[PDB]
Design an enzyme around this catalytic site. Sequence first.
Site, PDB file in Angstrom:
ATOM      1  N   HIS A   1       6.169  -2.774  15.275  1.00  0.00           N
ATOM      2  CA  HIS A   1       5.154  -2.375  16.248  1.00  0.00           C
ATOM      3  C   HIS A   1       5.635  -2.443  17.678  1.00  0.00           C
ATOM      4  O   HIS A   1       4.956  -1.906  18.555  1.00  0.00           O
ATOM      5  CB  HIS A   1       3.900  -3.236  16.169  1.00  0.00           C
ATOM      6  CG  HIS A   1       3.078  -3.004  14.951  1.00  0.00           C
ATOM      7  ND1 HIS A   1       2.070  -3.859  14.564  1.00  0.00           N
ATOM      8  CD2 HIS A   1       3.101  -2.009  14.035  1.00  0.00           C
ATOM      9  CE1 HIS A   1       1.514  -3.406  13.455  1.00  0.00           C
ATOM     10  NE2 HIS A   1       2.119  -2.283  13.116  1.00  0.00           N
TER      11      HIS A   1
ATOM     12  N   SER B   1       8.253   3.784  15.469  1.00  0.00           N
ATOM     13  CA  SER B   1       9.132   4.350  14.459  1.00  0.00           C
ATOM     14  C   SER B   1      10.221   5.197  15.089  1.00  0.00           C
ATOM     15  O   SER B   1      10.125   5.621  16.241  1.00  0.00           O
ATOM     16  CB  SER B   1       8.355   5.198  13.460  1.00  0.00           C
ATOM     17  OG  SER B   1       7.460   4.405  12.711  1.00  0.00           O
TER      18      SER B   1
ATOM     19  N   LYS C   1      -2.264  11.930   5.318  1.00  0.00           N
ATOM     20  CA  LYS C   1      -0.998  12.258   4.688  1.00  0.00           C
ATOM     21  C   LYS C   1      -0.550  11.152   3.755  1.00  0.00           C
ATOM     22  O   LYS C   1      -0.027  11.436   2.675  1.00  0.00           O
ATOM     23  CB  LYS C   1       0.054  12.546   5.747  1.00  0.00           C
ATOM     24  CG  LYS C   1       1.322  13.108   5.180  1.00  0.00           C
ATOM     25  CD  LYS C   1       2.226  13.595   6.279  1.00  0.00           C
ATOM     26  CE  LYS C   1       3.466  14.225   5.697  1.00  0.00           C
ATOM     27  NZ  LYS C   1       4.353  14.772   6.751  1.00  0.00           N
ATOM     28  N   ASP C   2      -0.774   9.894   4.125  1.00  0.00           N
ATOM     29  CA  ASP C   2      -0.493   8.816   3.183  1.00  0.00           C
ATOM     30  C   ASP C   2      -1.395   8.887   1.963  1.00  0.00           C
ATOM     31  O   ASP C   2      -0.922   8.726   0.836  1.00  0.00           O
ATOM     32  CB  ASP C   2      -0.623   7.459   3.864  1.00  0.00           C
ATOM     33  CG  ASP C   2       0.607   7.097   4.660  1.00  0.00           C
ATOM     34  OD1 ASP C   2       1.670   7.690   4.394  1.00  0.00           O
ATOM     35  OD2 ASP C   2       0.527   6.213   5.507  1.00  0.00           O
TER      36      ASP C   2
ATOM     37  N   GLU D   1      17.408  -3.712 -17.853  1.00  0.00           N
ATOM     38  CA  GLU D   1      16.768  -2.419 -17.748  1.00  0.00           C
ATOM     39  C   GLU D   1      17.440  -1.632 -16.634  1.00  0.00           C
ATOM     40  O   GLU D   1      18.318  -2.131 -15.928  1.00  0.00           O
ATOM     41  CB  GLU D   1      15.266  -2.564 -17.540  1.00  0.00           C
ATOM     42  CG  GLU D   1      14.852  -3.355 -16.331  1.00  0.00           C
ATOM     43  CD  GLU D   1      13.348  -3.567 -16.276  1.00  0.00           C
ATOM     44  OE1 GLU D   1      12.602  -2.786 -16.901  1.00  0.00           O
ATOM     45  OE2 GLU D   1      12.912  -4.535 -15.628  1.00  0.00           O
TER      46      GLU D   1
HETATM   47  C1  HEM Z   1       8.600  -4.544  -0.395  1.00  0.00           C
HETATM   48  C2  HEM Z   1       9.512  -4.107   0.472  1.00  0.00           C
HETATM   49  C3  HEM Z   1       9.170  -3.254   1.706  1.00  0.00           C
HETATM   50  C4  HEM Z   1       8.004  -2.934   2.230  1.00  0.00           C
HETATM   51  C5  HEM Z   1       6.591  -3.340   1.788  1.00  0.00           C
HETATM   52  C6  HEM Z   1       8.268  -2.107   3.362  1.00  0.00           C
HETATM   53  C7  HEM Z   1       7.310  -1.595   4.138  1.00  0.00           C
HETATM   54  C8  HEM Z   1       7.624  -0.937   5.255  1.00  0.00           C
HETATM   55  C9  HEM Z   1       6.669  -0.219   6.009  1.00  0.00           C
HETATM   56  C10 HEM Z   1       5.191  -0.110   5.647  1.00  0.00           C
HETATM   57  C11 HEM Z   1       7.282   0.299   7.035  1.00  0.00           C
HETATM   58  C12 HEM Z   1       6.620   1.151   8.113  1.00  0.00           C
HETATM   59  C13 HEM Z   1       6.655   2.565   7.591  1.00  0.00           C
HETATM   60  C14 HEM Z   1       8.051   3.037   7.823  1.00  0.00           C
HETATM   61  O1  HEM Z   1       8.595   2.713   8.906  1.00  0.00           O
HETATM   62  O2  HEM Z   1       8.620   3.717   6.936  1.00  0.00           O
HETATM   63  C15 HEM Z   1       8.660  -0.077   6.939  1.00  0.00           C
HETATM   64  C16 HEM Z   1       9.620   0.263   7.820  1.00  0.00           C
HETATM   65  C17 HEM Z   1      10.928  -0.005   7.652  1.00  0.00           C
HETATM   66  N1  HEM Z   1      11.462  -0.750   6.644  1.00  0.00           N
HETATM   67 FE1  HEM Z   1      10.471  -1.549   5.155  1.00  0.00          FE
HETATM   68  N2  HEM Z   1       9.605  -1.913   3.522  1.00  0.00           N
HETATM   69  C18 HEM Z   1      10.166  -2.618   2.502  1.00  0.00           C
HETATM   70  C19 HEM Z   1      11.475  -2.732   2.239  1.00  0.00           C
HETATM   71  C20 HEM Z   1      12.416  -2.464   3.150  1.00  0.00           C
HETATM   72  C21 HEM Z   1      13.796  -2.717   2.928  1.00  0.00           C
HETATM   73  C22 HEM Z   1      14.335  -3.308   1.623  1.00  0.00           C
HETATM   74  C23 HEM Z   1      14.431  -2.331   4.007  1.00  0.00           C
HETATM   75  C24 HEM Z   1      15.923  -2.376   4.316  1.00  0.00           C
HETATM   76  C25 HEM Z   1      16.789  -3.012   3.538  1.00  0.00           C
HETATM   77  C26 HEM Z   1      13.448  -1.845   4.924  1.00  0.00           C
HETATM   78  C27 HEM Z   1      13.736  -1.361   6.147  1.00  0.00           C
HETATM   79  C28 HEM Z   1      12.803  -0.744   6.892  1.00  0.00           C
HETATM   80  C29 HEM Z   1      13.092   0.010   8.066  1.00  0.00           C
HETATM   81  C30 HEM Z   1      14.492   0.223   8.641  1.00  0.00           C
HETATM   82  C31 HEM Z   1      11.954   0.461   8.535  1.00  0.00           C
HETATM   83  C32 HEM Z   1      11.702   1.318   9.786  1.00  0.00           C
HETATM   84  C33 HEM Z   1      12.306   2.706   9.667  1.00  0.00           C
HETATM   85  C34 HEM Z   1      11.696   3.618  10.698  1.00  0.00           C
HETATM   86  O3  HEM Z   1      10.732   3.200  11.382  1.00  0.00           O
HETATM   87  O4  HEM Z   1      12.170   4.773  10.829  1.00  0.00           O
HETATM   88  N3  HEM Z   1      12.200  -1.930   4.381  1.00  0.00           N
HETATM   89  N4  HEM Z   1       8.852  -0.848   5.829  1.00  0.00           N
HETATM   90  C1  HEM Z   2       6.137  -7.403  -7.048  1.00  0.00           C
HETATM   91  C2  HEM Z   2       5.281  -7.891  -7.937  1.00  0.00           C
HETATM   92  C3  HEM Z   2       5.567  -7.920  -9.437  1.00  0.00           C
HETATM   93  C4  HEM Z   2       6.564  -7.404 -10.122  1.00  0.00           C
HETATM   94  C5  HEM Z   2       7.764  -6.577  -9.653  1.00  0.00           C
HETATM   95  C6  HEM Z   2       6.352  -7.738 -11.489  1.00  0.00           C
HETATM   96  C7  HEM Z   2       7.174  -7.368 -12.475  1.00  0.00           C
HETATM   97  C8  HEM Z   2       6.940  -7.738 -13.733  1.00  0.00           C
HETATM   98  C9  HEM Z   2       7.760  -7.312 -14.802  1.00  0.00           C
HETATM   99  C10 HEM Z   2       8.981  -6.406 -14.661  1.00  0.00           C
HETATM  100  C11 HEM Z   2       7.284  -7.839 -15.888  1.00  0.00           C
HETATM  101  C12 HEM Z   2       7.823  -7.662 -17.303  1.00  0.00           C
HETATM  102  C13 HEM Z   2       7.238  -6.347 -17.786  1.00  0.00           C
HETATM  103  C14 HEM Z   2       6.923  -6.452 -19.245  1.00  0.00           C
HETATM  104  O1  HEM Z   2       7.230  -7.511 -19.824  1.00  0.00           O
HETATM  105  O2  HEM Z   2       6.373  -5.487 -19.826  1.00  0.00           O
HETATM  106  C15 HEM Z   2       6.142  -8.601 -15.519  1.00  0.00           C
HETATM  107  C16 HEM Z   2       5.396  -9.279 -16.399  1.00  0.00           C
HETATM  108  C17 HEM Z   2       4.409 -10.106 -16.026  1.00  0.00           C
HETATM  109  N1  HEM Z   2       3.914 -10.232 -14.762  1.00  0.00           N
HETATM  110 FE1  HEM Z   2       4.588  -9.437 -13.127  1.00  0.00          FE
HETATM  111  N2  HEM Z   2       5.217  -8.471 -11.635  1.00  0.00           N
HETATM  112  C18 HEM Z   2       4.723  -8.592 -10.372  1.00  0.00           C
HETATM  113  C19 HEM Z   2       3.600  -9.258 -10.033  1.00  0.00           C
HETATM  114  C20 HEM Z   2       2.934 -10.063 -10.887  1.00  0.00           C
HETATM  115  C21 HEM Z   2       1.799 -10.838 -10.515  1.00  0.00           C
HETATM  116  C22 HEM Z   2       1.234 -10.857  -9.092  1.00  0.00           C
HETATM  117  C23 HEM Z   2       1.425 -11.498 -11.588  1.00  0.00           C
HETATM  118  C24 HEM Z   2       0.277 -12.471 -11.828  1.00  0.00           C
HETATM  119  C25 HEM Z   2      -0.828 -12.412 -11.103  1.00  0.00           C
HETATM  120  C26 HEM Z   2       2.288 -11.126 -12.641  1.00  0.00           C
HETATM  121  C27 HEM Z   2       2.171 -11.623 -13.874  1.00  0.00           C
HETATM  122  C28 HEM Z   2       2.943 -11.184 -14.874  1.00  0.00           C
HETATM  123  C29 HEM Z   2       2.841 -11.647 -16.220  1.00  0.00           C
HETATM  124  C30 HEM Z   2       1.876 -12.710 -16.757  1.00  0.00           C
HETATM  125  C31 HEM Z   2       3.732 -11.001 -16.909  1.00  0.00           C
HETATM  126  C32 HEM Z   2       3.971 -11.170 -18.397  1.00  0.00           C
HETATM  127  C33 HEM Z   2       3.109 -10.111 -19.035  1.00  0.00           C
HETATM  128  C34 HEM Z   2       4.061  -9.163 -19.677  1.00  0.00           C
HETATM  129  O3  HEM Z   2       5.235  -9.145 -19.251  1.00  0.00           O
HETATM  130  O4  HEM Z   2       3.652  -8.447 -20.618  1.00  0.00           O
HETATM  131  N3  HEM Z   2       3.222 -10.248 -12.204  1.00  0.00           N
HETATM  132  N4  HEM Z   2       5.933  -8.536 -14.175  1.00  0.00           N
END
Ligand code: HEM
Ligand code: HEM
Lengths: 49, 39, 62, 241, 81, 379, 379
Positions: free
Chosen positions: F201, F205, F227-228, F271
């Site tokens: 902020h 951007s 658009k989002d 995977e």
């Molecule tokens: C769960 C992971 C992430 C979330 C929720 C997230 C979310 C966001 C959001 C909502 C924005 C503002 C919209 C935008 O600028 O595109 C943003 C900007 C950005 N994020 Fe993340 N992002 C994630 C992961 C990452 C990662 C892994 C990277 C780099 C390794 C990254 C780098 C950036 C950059 C460079 C910007 C600004 C780019 C620009 O403004 O042109 N983000 N991110």
């Molecule tokens: C970024 C957030 C999350 C990711 C990437 C994620 C990813 C995963 C993945 C890859 C599995 C295994 C998929 C499968 O076994 O079919 C899994 C299973 C599970 N996740 Fe998450 N999860 C997230 C958030 C959560 C949250 C917030 C909860 C609880 C509130 C949760 C509870 C579970 C449970 C209980 C399982 C076992 C159920 C199952 O695998 O069948 N996960 N999750």
Amino acid sequence: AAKNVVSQFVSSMSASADVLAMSKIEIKLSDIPEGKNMAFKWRGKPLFV
Amino acid sequence: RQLARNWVPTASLWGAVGAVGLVWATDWRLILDWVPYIN
Amino acid sequence: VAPTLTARLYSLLFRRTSTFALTIVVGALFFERAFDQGADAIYEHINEGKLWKHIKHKYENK
Amino acid sequence: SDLELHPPSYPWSHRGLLSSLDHTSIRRGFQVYKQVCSSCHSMDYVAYRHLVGVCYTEDEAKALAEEVEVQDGPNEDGEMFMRPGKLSDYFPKPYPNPEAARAANNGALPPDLSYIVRARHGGEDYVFSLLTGYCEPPTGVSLREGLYFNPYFPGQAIGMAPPIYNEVLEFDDGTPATMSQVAKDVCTFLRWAAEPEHDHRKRMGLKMLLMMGLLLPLVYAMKRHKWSVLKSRKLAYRPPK
Amino acid sequence: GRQFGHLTRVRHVITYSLSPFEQRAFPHYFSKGIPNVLRRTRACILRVAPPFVAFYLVYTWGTQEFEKSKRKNPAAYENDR
Amino acid sequence: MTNIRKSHPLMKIVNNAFIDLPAPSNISSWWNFGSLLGICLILQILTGLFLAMHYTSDTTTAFSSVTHICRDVNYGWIIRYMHANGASMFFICLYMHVGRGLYYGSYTFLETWNIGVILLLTVMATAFMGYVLPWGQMSFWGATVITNLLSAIPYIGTNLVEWIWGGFSVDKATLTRFFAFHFILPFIIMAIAMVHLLFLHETGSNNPTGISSDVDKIPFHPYYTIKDILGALLLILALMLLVLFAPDLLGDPDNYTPANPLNTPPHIKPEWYFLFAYAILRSIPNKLGGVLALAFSILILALIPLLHTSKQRSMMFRPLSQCLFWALVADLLTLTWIGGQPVEHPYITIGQLASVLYFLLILVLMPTAGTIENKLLKW
Amino acid sequence: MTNIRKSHPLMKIVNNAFIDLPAPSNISSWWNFGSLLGICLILQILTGLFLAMHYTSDTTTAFSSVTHICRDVNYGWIIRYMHANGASMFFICLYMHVGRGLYYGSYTFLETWNIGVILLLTVMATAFMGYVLPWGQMSFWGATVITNLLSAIPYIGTNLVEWIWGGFSVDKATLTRFFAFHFILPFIIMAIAMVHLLFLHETGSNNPTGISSDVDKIPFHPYYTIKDILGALLLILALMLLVLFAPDLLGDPDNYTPANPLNTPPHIKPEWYFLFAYAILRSIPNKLGGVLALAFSILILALIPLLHTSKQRSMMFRPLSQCLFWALVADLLTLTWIGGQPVEHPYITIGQLASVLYFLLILVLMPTAGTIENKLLKW
Ligand code: HEM
Ligand code: HEM
Ligand code: HEC
Ligand code: HEM
Ligand code: HEM
Ligand code: FES
């Protein structure tokens, strides 16, 4: 699209389909006639019937 | 003053907005069938 | 000339934002009642004799 | 590095998008299980709850159940009971124990059949052509006594004696019992056990599409409506210069 | 806006203080203190004690009245009849 | 600001970090992955929750319970399938969200990048642990490999592993942990996210041409909010269409069998989205040196900002600097399929070749490419 | 602000909401319970965590597992005892933190009060559910009573209860839920907390005399930071001294027996801090009307700001308005011990008496008390 999914999640918590099958299973049709009969166990508890 | 202006006919509707809403929101008496209603 | 169906419609409904909201509710109300009923037949008409709905007639009430 | 052949894809009554299962054939498909697979391969994960899926009406299912079940019921007033009661039971296992299972199998271990469809690669076609295929050992290859040569199986030596011959059974229907007809009727059944929700889900599969046809253009209608002011811009640079 | 600058306006108020080193961590802690505790213990105690006192009585009274009722059955009705 | 309702609770002035946040005019759809990460994150936690209510963590129970969901629970089959496939549709977003990062040179923002790096590095941990929870065959051995791999550390290695396991092997207490972690940990990601968005902020951007956009700005409410949403909608199909018709397609692991420590499956892989990392490892014959590369694989993303070698930010104007970049894409794509193959001399050599190339592009060529073009344009 | 390190990451300017937050000069120790809630909250979540790693949620397992902690896990006995007793030392703070609220008339801050109300109302829910988790005897029946009580609602009651139970009774799926809730829910409290603190930064704290303190302010870093630490220290003993020498004292429930639905314990009560609420209920013979009071018990705290009846904020200057207030203290204290007693006729009448008095003090007397004294001082 809104109402279904909302109603779909909430339909997860409410009731299992397995437990519902374990509700009121005692059908009777046996006992032991007269005043002694036999017994059963309905929802957890079990005494005399 | 108090002049309650179209705000009253305004609110009146809005009250009827949600009232139908809950019926639609939920189900219950499903409501006298009135165009399809499953058995 | 008489107003086109919209020209009426806009004046009667979408003007007042209340009605503009209300009409939406009743709209989806009737909508789901008719809409869902059609979707089944279309699907059901695809599978004939593959469902007890038809199949169950062979054995139901003996 | 045994050459693994692949099952050639057969047509399937459920193969299509909106295609469903045939319940009629399933009834047969179950009947086989109770006949043959009862020996060794079990299914732990299913109850008698079948009712209308395979079309068995609750009455029929009850009588169907109350023959099968379970042991005992008098262990000092703690335990289970004869004659299951309601459908609640799961399916009786032929074996008390992995060891007693393996022992009679001559060191072999029968796998569970519940989800075995989704377990092995290749889908159900794997099973059908597997039970289909039994060949004569090629010249210059030897096997253990129980082991039988079958190409699809990875080691191509299987301790399963081939179950099926032409007309092992009679059907509740009475359709002639054929090694081909019998086999497929099973390979439909298992496909239902691995995802009992099957026939139910594709409803939305259709019904969400018919829903979704509306929005995408409609939403795309609005987007251009709002932005239409930007894409209509005109600039001009009028310096007093 | 920023907190300290604009707070309020004060005029002609002078302040004096010493380093914390120059002075002591206990300027007659016991001597000057122990009276100070007392004079400020009594100002409240008139307003505080009485309600709790009422409670404790009820508590004691309550148990006794409770006790007689249950523990002694042959009290109101003795075992004759 | 007379009777503007945006002041009165203060918290809403914090909510004018969205609505009036000024933005560039021209923005490609490639910037929609800002939101679509968030929504793919929320949609987890809920659908991630209602799984928890019926799941049970025990060596004896766990697998039985997952059976119990798909069978007996009303609407129980959709959720498990939304959750799992809701993971893959999470990464496929995530990578793109990095890709936009390089190719427009957004990494010039120096802090927001870093917090980007960590925020990635955490997810890869979470989406791992959960994958153990079903306690199926591919979960058991796929657990031993990854962890036991960590023993490479010269001295403290032998203890440090046994510590996490809470024993000699992957039996119970190793499971119960990985539930209690996989549960809490996403909340922390949500914690960082509201930081990772913060610094942004301040500077606003970037925009596709790589030019300071100051003269041209637009309110965020009437325009990009639609658009989002439009962006938010196309996800659902891409999520639904997959999760509904073809459940197991991207569900590539075929193994539901209850884990038996004695047996071993012939082929073992994570995977899909992990593979390429796991492919890097097989290359190095030397064990210890092997592990470092895998750790060094991602971290290099942090060093990229030091390598900004040219006088203009974008790669939309540098043909060379664009030419190479795409080769890196196939290079990764190569690694993916490589690791997904047995270790047999036609494959073996290849991975070793693609390995060096990968670093050579990032760490040598690209920083050189900018140098020449400065010289070309007479800069 | 030349090279002041407080700007450079922005996040640290957000961290000058603490250090230079100006405060009154004179502040009684009674304002230390601002912090000591927080630290009692943090110290939970950690100690709340390392229990989770060995706990298991099953009707068959759960109780066995809690056995397994106190016996077999290295340092396993301290943690369970820090967690449970870390609950009671949480409330005993919390109430005081309300008490300061009234008696100095801090509720004049109108919003921050309300968010105060909710923030209470949540805790009482959490610290409930967890108390089911051990699945002991007093947990089982103490579960049925509270929930089944909710059936009083005229029509939807019968369904709404069966919904939460996920069945006809308190068997398994009723347990698994109350784990997954009691786990997540504190994080939300932590979420609100950083809101509940927000509005406060606008108007600053109140001060004991009930006077606008503007002319006299003090930096927050050198001074009150020590005093909270000093405050933070005395807790530990009061926590340790209890948890270490005398574990079960405040652990008043005596019942570790594995729950048997058939048997019933002769006496049944919640743990201590709840009792008075549960005591209100026994008073009303009419069931439905009975429940409302219990719900209406706390909520009245929200209506208090309407009742500010006088021209001066503090109660330190109003003897009458002070006189009554203390009677209310014993009145509560009464209720506590009342509910902790059987329902014989010497007790029965008493609770009915103390019930009316309670409301009569808050809802009639106190708002009247301010009226007279305005008239006295010639205001
Ligand atoms: C769960 C992971 C992430 C979330 C929720 C997230 C979310 C966001 C959001 C909502 C924005 C503002 C919209 C935008 O600028 O595109 C943003 C900007 C950005 N994020 Fe993340 N992002 C994630 C992961 C990452 C990662 C892994 C990277 C780099 C390794 C990254 C780098 C950036 C950059 C460079 C910007 C600004 C780019 C620009 O403004 O042109 N983000 N991110
Ligand atoms: C970024 C957030 C999350 C990711 C990437 C994620 C990813 C995963 C993945 C890859 C599995 C295994 C998929 C499968 O076994 O079919 C899994 C299973 C599970 N996740 Fe998450 N999860 C997230 C958030 C959560 C949250 C917030 C909860 C609880 C509130 C949760 C509870 C579970 C449970 C209980 C399982 C076992 C159920 C199952 O695998 O069948 N996960 N999750
Ligand atoms: C003679 C007892 C017996 C009969 C009856 C039997 N099975 Fe087999 N079957 C086995 C055993 C034991 C194995 C596994 C042996 C092995 O893997 O070497 C096996 C193998 C299988 C396999 C493949 C197992 C694997 O390792 O992939 C399937 C699928 C199978 N049986 C299903 C069936 C079906 C369908 C039927 C009914 C036509 C049936 N079984 C009847 C004993 C039997
Ligand atoms: C405000 C925060 C919390 C409060 C008031 C609280 C309160 C409680 C209480 C009263 C119990 C029952 C005490 C007992 O059975 O001896 C309990 C148990 C438990 N709590 Fe919490 N807790 C809190 C936070 C947490 C957190 C953050 C976690 C998990 C990370 C957690 C996990 C557990 C578990 C697993 C139990 C069962 C262990 C046991 O009861 O022996 N609690 N908690
Ligand atoms: C977990 C619960 C709570 C936490 C973490 C918490 C924390 C705090 C903190 C740190 C402060 C600043 C220090 C102070 O002003 O004393 C504060 C102020 C305050 N809180 Fe809370 N509090 C909690 C519960 C409550 C409740 C339940 C209420 C009212 C029902 C409440 C009402 C207030 C008020 C009125 C103030 C300001 C009083 C003043 O500034 O003089 N708080 N709270
Ligand atoms: S509800 Fe049964 S005793 Fe109060």
